[PDB]
Amino acid sequence: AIPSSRVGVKINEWYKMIRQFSVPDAEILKAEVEQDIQQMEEDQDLLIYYSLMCFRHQLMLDYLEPTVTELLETIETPQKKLTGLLKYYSLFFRGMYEFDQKEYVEAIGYYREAEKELPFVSDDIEKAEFHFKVAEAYYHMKQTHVSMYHILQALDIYQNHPLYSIRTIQSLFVIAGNYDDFKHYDKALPHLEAALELAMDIQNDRFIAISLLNIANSYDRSGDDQMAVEHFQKAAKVSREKVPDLLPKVLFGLSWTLCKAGQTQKAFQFIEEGLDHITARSHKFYKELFLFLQAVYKETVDERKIHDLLSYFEKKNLHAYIEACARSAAAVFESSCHFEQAAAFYRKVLKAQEDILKGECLYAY
């Protein structure tokens, strides 16, 4: 599937040909875009940008039936709102394209230029939408303070529009997620609870299950295993009954929490259960996380399995998984006073941390 940002930048190129009134080139690019979309990931925002460009493209044809500069002013002046919106999209999707190739500094620059176009748009939801999507980007970029800044602007507008409950819940998740980055799970919890309540009002089962899962993970990480297990099982129930595709993630949290709580026998039950729900189509690695739980919390640690999994993770550059699993292994070995093994895993932890950071900075100004 083609990322919509990739299609967005080709539209930007299409636009360039239009503004220089090159019909042959514009037609080629227009034809290519119409093919790429047939294989593009879902993005209704991209399709809007496409349709507006189709209109702008037609304007070019209608005005060719004079210097480029002159002809350009003739078309744009009467089309202020169109020209302004196109400019906004070209910058937005260019920013997302840079973001998708991990050119973060470039992305930020486009995000900033894009925002400057918002004031010329008489629509508060459009503004919210920009802040929300950018907030997610900054979060992935681990610029968590900036993410919070933006997401708080989105949520403000969303709350003024009670019909936008979905975005409100998603905004609450983002806020909680951001707090999690600073290990302030207690600060995240209130937002997760509001999300749960809102989700139940609109009777959305998926978001009820997800909210409950998020609450459980919050408690698990804050150190309240009892509340964690309680909510995991609540999420499990709603999952098994109405949203089964969440079961693997739900059962892994439950299992991990039970293992850390010393209830490994009970955990092994949900581990085997989760392994049976996993399908080949899946794109997640819960299979490998489940296998790691079995190996490390087993009466006698399965060191070979552990090595193969960590090696597997190393291969796909899954350093976050390495850090988390290595953290667990270190604690398990410490518990039996096997400190040499422990130290070995602690070194893997510190290594994984540095490998994550290095992967976050690929530019070279």
Binding site: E42, S51, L52
Partner: protein, 116 residues
């Protein structure tokens, strides 16, 4: 005549507005269900372009409420990645036609002069 454009996205509204003004129509615009209903009640449009994909208030709900205000209402629905059952259902409720996004500007323009 009067054309009511209903869509939650600024982009679509700008587009169809520029398209229908060029044809000489008197165009109205709404971002959500309530605004759309108030305009139907007050202006009584001759044709409606309704986005069935609006947050918080599904088009199915909006559609029936428009039939309440006017029975012979002329409504064309448009969708982006919309279900086939919501399209089929909308038809049974007297939908003149359905335009998938991204819709062709010419097609939807010719369809307007038709059912109008």
């Amino acid at each position: 005549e009067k054309i009511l454009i209903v869509d939650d996205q600024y982009g679509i509204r700008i587009l169809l507005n520029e398209v229908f003004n060029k044809e000489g129509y008197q165009t109205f615009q709404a971002a959500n269900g309530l605004q759309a209903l108030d305009i139907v009640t007050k202006e009584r449009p001759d044709l409606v372009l309704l986005d069935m994909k609006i947050p918080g208030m599904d088009g199915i709900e909006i559609l029936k409420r428009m039939k309440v205000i006017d029975e012979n209402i002329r409504v064309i629905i448009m969708t982006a990645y919309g279900e086939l059952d919501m399209i089929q259902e909308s038809k049974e409720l007297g939908a003149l036609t359905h335009f998938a996004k991204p819709f062709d500007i010419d097609e939807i323009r010719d369809a307007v002069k038709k059912y109008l």
